[PDB]
């Protein structure tokens, strides 16, 4: 048997952070996730919301269970902690760059755990927050996580960019550079 698609409902709960996540995945792409604070379903692509619905408060029922079970597993594992596993960071654009033509820079953060990471887009050293989009931690067969961040930009020979990622598995922040060559 060769497979065709896989839909994965993935959810996690992490102590001490007390972070949780509920999300659906179709072939590597997230369909939606439930904003735990706004108790609201957020679809990766709005269009999706025209074809389907999800009761966002149920996701919270689940995270409550997951936390309960974390408490129980943590105790039965005699408090065996998770081994940080640092992320592979790669920065690439959306399409070939043409000067003074809009594009998007993607910072792909991969193969890491626990699911807590800080990311910053730096343009010429300064943090950029305009237009910055990002995804939630996507699941991996290896039980580690995956994540992306985007920064819509206008190509010029004048600016240089970096994606600065912070993870507890790295001994110092990681800058993956990008500049027109």
């Amino acid at each position: 048997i060769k497979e065709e698609h896989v839909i994965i409902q993935a959810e996690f709960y992490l102590n001490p952070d007390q972070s949780g996540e509920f999300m659906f995945d179709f072939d590597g792409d997230e369909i939606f996730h439930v904003d735990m604070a706004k108790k609201e379903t957020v679809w990766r692509l709005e269009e999706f919301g025209r074809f389907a619905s999800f009761e966002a408060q149920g996701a919270l029922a689940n995270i409550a269970v997951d936390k309960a079970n974390l408490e129980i597993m943590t105790k039965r594992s005699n408090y065996t902690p998770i081994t940080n596993v640092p992320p592979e960071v790669t920065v690439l654009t959306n399409s070939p760059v043409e000067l003074r033509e809009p594009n998007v820079l993607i910072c792909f953060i991969d193969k890491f755990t626990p699911p807590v990471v800080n990311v910053t887009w730096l343009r010429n050293g300064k943090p950029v927050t305009t237009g910055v989009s990002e995804t939630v931690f996507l699941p991996r067969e290896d039980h580690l996580f995956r994540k992306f961040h985007y920064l819509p930009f206008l190509p010029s020979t004048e600016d240089v960019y970096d994606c600065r990622v912070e993870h507890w598995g790295l001994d110092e922040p990681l800058l993956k550079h990008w500049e027109f060559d």
Partner: protein, 192 residues
């Protein structure tokens, strides 16, 4: 910075679909930190401790025949149902790619250069990109990037071709993807 040890719990339900939904297999799995401890595989019919931590859970959960029956029906109640709720916007999604061919270092002739065929923004990820040297197929020197999942329901791929440009030649990048009946082709002419 924060030195405190973390403990993480993850629960994944995976609906694996074969030949549409002709064969469906649900595999639910509990993962402690990065170690999967117990799971329910529809092909087996019950929980199975994957590692020694899950044994208590596998044994307990399998005791609750209520749970075991709901899960057993999950491939129809959950899996096939969700595949059906999302079919038109996920399974039946098709975004065509745009092909662009450009030599890697815009410099003069009769010298090693990689021609680049950039294929981006498509979905599904199944694609076929080929290089042709004056109408003939190039299976040598193709430095391909593999398929890149961009995260926004779009994929991209860059397939290079090592060439010793000699003029009068034409190299063609041919792309085949579900979203087109006839292949897209982007041609390049060896600077005269």
């Amino acid at each position: 910075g924060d030195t405190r040890p973390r403990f993480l719990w993850q629960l994944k339900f995976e609906c694996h679909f074969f030949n549409g939904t002709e064969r469906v297999r649900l595999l639910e799995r509990c993962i402690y930190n990065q170690e999967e401890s117990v799971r329910f595989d529809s092909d087996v019919g019950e929980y199975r401790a994957v590692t020694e931590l899950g044994r208590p859970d596998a044994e307990y959960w399998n005791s609750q025949k209520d749970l075991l029956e709901q899960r057993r029906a999950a491939v129809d109640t959950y899996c096939r149902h969700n595949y059906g709720v999302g079919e038109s916007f996920t399974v039946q999604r098709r975004v065509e790619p745009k092909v662009t061919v450009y030599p890697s270092k815009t410099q003069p002739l009769q010298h090693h250069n990689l021609l680049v065929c950039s294929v981006s923004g498509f979905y599904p990820g199944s694609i076929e990109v080929r290089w042709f040297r004056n109408g003939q197929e190039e299976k040598a020197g193709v430095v391909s990037t593999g398929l890149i999942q961009n995260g926004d329901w779009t994929f991209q791929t860059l397939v290079m071709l090592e060439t010793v440009p000699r003029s009068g030649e034409v190299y063609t990048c041919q792309v085949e993807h579900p979203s087109v009946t006839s292949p897209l082709t982007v041609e390049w002419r060896a600077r005269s």
